[PDB]
Nucleic acid binder design. Structure first.
Ligand code: MG
Ligand code: MG
Ligand code: MG
Length: 118
RNA sequence: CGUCGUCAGCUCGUGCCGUGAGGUGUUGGGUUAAGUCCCGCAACGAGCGCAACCCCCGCCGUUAGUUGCCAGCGGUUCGG
């Protein structure tokens, strides 16, 4: 019910542009495309999802980062529905390490939403 | 105080990179008088600069008329 759908379009990408440390999961090469194996894919999906199901109800927050044209609005839609923050548009330089500084930009957003209804 | 020159610049906080000096921000294309602004961006902002806030000169209005003008019967030293 997982790989029945994951075998839809959700596997098989970039030809001859490959980071070869990813070759654990890389299955074959047909029409140039490095097709990715689905078995280790789904077990690695469980390895992620066990951690997500732990640290998602432990008060832990997920930060959904996606910048390409392909993954913009389907990150923006599915990111706001668990309270989890996202970056739909260009994710800036140091939102995380410089978080205490970009908190000032969030507060300027709040003190500008004060100036909207003003 | 003159000067580079009213020239568009010089920086900082924090983050990143770099052993380090130091970058980055401030590069790039566009744009203006301008580091002016926006689009991308390891940058996000901020400070002094620029601009604007000041004043004159421009037009119009309100108030005010011992300057000002004939519109007015009309004096008339016959002259604002
Ligand atoms: Mg500096
Ligand atoms: Mg270091
Ligand atoms: Mg400036």
């Amino acid at each position: 019910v997982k790989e029945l759908l994951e075998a839809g379009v959700h596997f098989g990408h970039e030809r001859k542009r490959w980071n070869p440390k990813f070759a654990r999961y890389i299955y074959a090469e047909r029409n140039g495309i490095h097709i990715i194996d689905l078995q280790k894919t789904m077990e690695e999906l469980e390895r992620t999802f066990r951690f997500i199901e732990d640290l998602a109800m432990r008060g832990g927050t997920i930060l959904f980062v996606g910048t390409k044209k392909q993954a913009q609005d389907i990150v923006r839609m599915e990111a706001e529905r668990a309270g989890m923050p996202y970056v739909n548009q260009r994710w800036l330089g140091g939102m995380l390490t410089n978080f205490k500084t970009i908190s000032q930009r969030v507060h300027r957003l709040e003190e500008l939403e004060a100036l909207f209804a003003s």
